[PDB]
Write a protein that binds this ligand. Structure first.
Ligand SMILES: OC[C@H]1O[C@H](O[C@H]2[C@H](O)[C@@H](O)[C@@H](O)O[C@@H]2CO)[C@H](O)[C@@H](O)[C@@H]1O
Ligand SMILES: OC[C@H]1O[C@H](O[C@H]2[C@H](O)[C@@H](O)[C@@H](O)O[C@@H]2CO)[C@H](O)[C@@H](O)[C@@H]1O
Ligand code: CL
Ligand code: CU
Ligand code: CU
Lengths: 370, 369
């Protein structure tokens, strides 16, 4: 079970958990309540397992797409901000955390992937995916590469897969049709085929993951990476002269990243719901609370209107929002976990050459629709 | 082709490359010759590909096991230390880089994996692999795990596989029989099966890699990890109260890590062979040079006698040598790269459940021979 009189928070290890811990220290200084911030592996998978038994964190942070599943499984407390508090956050961010008519988490920030590039190696970033092999040929001659990014998580490859027509679930008449999946269509096939060709022609390696790409970019081994706002801090530290910009187009069309709203849900089994509410509304979701987290690892475009307006002039955030507008907000429906698992397998199997692109996506299509 | 009048060095990203760069800056300061230290991805695969076309770095750092393969391909210059310099290093480290009667690299340091444990979480670490499932169950109740280590590179799982009888190439009377491969015998199958069982029982995850394990240990999420001396610097930084100790036994037998001698080879295509020799003999392989590297990322037990003497009181190094004594120094023969590729595939396939242990090891056996 969950311990009373304190708060346990889970957040992913790529986020500003040290900053969040500082907000927690302030909370403790004011209320005497200890806040423990943890970053378990696979937390988005563990949470539903442990929460069902009445254990786990008081508060879970993740992108909003996971939350409908958690809500449908009875794992989340309905949140009860008054109208005054609601007015403090952008309406579209509340939309991301509304499920079956109820608010099931507090929205924190809007995230989208951008192209990040080393201005020393590449003063002019490429407008198109198609020119990346040419850039890589140039750079390979200097002992570098053009582009490295996490190929192990479909989140990162999705923008390209979606560009020419791939989609998750078709929206119609105000709801997602979970039986209409867009993962094995011509557009999705074109996008994944391009990625696989990049690997076949040795411009990328199938096993490149988050840490490998981050290392390479931050040590100037590769001219570009694809990543979210949380990654800017480590780049700052590495002293690389970087820019953040619109993702490359594919077949003349915008890459379409899936947009996540980082959100904080309260465990239905928590005996500290009021403390969790006070922490989130009166400490984290303030100018100063968001600053503490953002200073650790940037959040993106925060849900709090006041602080968002303050940071909006940041060109990196402008780029983030440009990419977000070109993409689509993720659904929060329970079927999303099945979608992501299916596409994850498809990309890994196609990238490694274990399956053809056609075979991989045909299977994912079926798997995603249950 | 390689640029004349400078030095390009490749070394793995887990080593003290910044320390090495400092030795390089000292070289440039004294000679005007710029030294560029790089740490490319998959450099042990990269080097032979580019060196075959006469490009690549002037100097390549890797464990000695890969060097016999490079030499047979003609990718390395024979090196020419006088006897006075050779006597500066331990004969057994020179043995590791002797191929076809010739010295094909400079030995730098001796590496072996040890068990690293969080003293606060686990004051008395387990002596056996067999007690790990019960330890994990107890720690899981506390929100921790018992053990996380890199399951993606067979280097890290080899000690368990070799514990009860597994081996690469039969070594008899001072010679390796490249036809007598021990990767699919009862011992190796017992070892790998125990590993796969840990995963099946959720005590470990098949996808755990170097970064995941390092993060978990250095943030106190797991009580133990398995790693080499290069890892200690990041643990120091993390403030985890750690100890370095003997690997757990399996079926009553010591884990048997493959011991590596970090070594520096000179590209046969380098136009700077003399500069490279100078940098290596007169700058790197000195108490000051090695200290610079070691202070960045610990080297282990260095090949240079004088400096090894000076660091030998370090209990972490003593534990490293105790594990090394229980293991086996790697062969340097050309067949090693085939051996490693085959075993890596087998461990990953068995761990993921894509193939049975028996089938994975049988394929590796065939591929390695
Ligand atoms: O890759 C599938 C994965 O995508 C998204 O996860 C993102 C997350 O939104 C970001 O905040 C960041 O942490 O990177 C993650 C990808 O590694 C979905 O939110 C997640 O449900 C899904 O499994
Ligand atoms: O995993 C196979 C791999 O094992 C050894 O590589 C070690 C290396 O010796 C250490 O210095 C350290 O870098 O970790 C490596 C494992 O990731 C062999 O030397 C290497 O040939 C082999 O592929
Ligand atoms: Cl819907
Ligand atoms: Cu963590
Ligand atoms: Cu590197």
């Amino acid at each position: 079970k969950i311990e009373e009189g304190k708060l346990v928070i889970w957040i992913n290890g790529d986020k500003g958990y040290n900053g969040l811990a500082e907000v927690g220290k302030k909370f403790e200084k004011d209320t005497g309540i200890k806040v423990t911030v943890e970053h378990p592996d696979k937390l988005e998978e563990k949470f539903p397992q442990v929460a069902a038994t009445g254990d786990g964190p008081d508060i879970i942070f993740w992108a909003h797409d996971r939350f409908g599943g958690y809500a449908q499984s009875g794992l989340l407390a309905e949140i009860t901000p008054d109208k005054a508090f609601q007015d403090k956050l952008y309406p579209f961010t509340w939309d991301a955390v509304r499920y079956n008519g109820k608010l099931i988490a507090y929205p924190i920030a809007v995230e989208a992937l951008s192209l990040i590039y080393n201005k020393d190696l590449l003063p002019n970033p490429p407008k198109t995916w198609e020119e990346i092999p040419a850039l890589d040929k140039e750079l390979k001659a200097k002992g570098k590469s053009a582009l490295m990014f996490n190929l192990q998580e479909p989140y990162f490859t999705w923008p390209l897969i979606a560009a020419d027509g791939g989609y998750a679930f078709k929206y119609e008449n105000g709801k997602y049709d979970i039986k209409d999946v867009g993962v094995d269509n011509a557009g999705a096939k074109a996008g994944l085929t391009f990625l696989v060709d990049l690997i076949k022609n040795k411009h990328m390696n199938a096993d490149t993951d988050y840490s490998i790409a981050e290392h390479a970019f931050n040590h100037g081994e590769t001219a570009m990476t694809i990543n979210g706002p949380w990654a800017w801090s480590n780049i700052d530290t590495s002293k690389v002269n970087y820019g953040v910009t619109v993702l490359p187009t594919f077949k003349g069309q915008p890459s379409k990243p899936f947009v996540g709203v980082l959100s904080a849900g309260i465990n239905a089994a928590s005996p500290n719901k009021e403390l969790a509410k006070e922490f989130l509304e009166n400490y984290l979701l303030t100018d100063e609370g968001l600053e503490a987290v953002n200073k650790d690892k940037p959040l993106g475009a925060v849900a709090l209107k006041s602080y968002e307006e303050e940071l909006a002039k940041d060109p990196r955030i402008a780029a983030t929002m440009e990419n977000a507008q070109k993409g689509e907000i993720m659904p929060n429906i329970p079927q999303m976990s099945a979608f992501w698992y299916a596409v994850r397998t498809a990309v890994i199997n196609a990238a490694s050459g274990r399956q053809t692109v056609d075979a991989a996506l045909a299977a994912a299509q079926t798997n995603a629709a249950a």
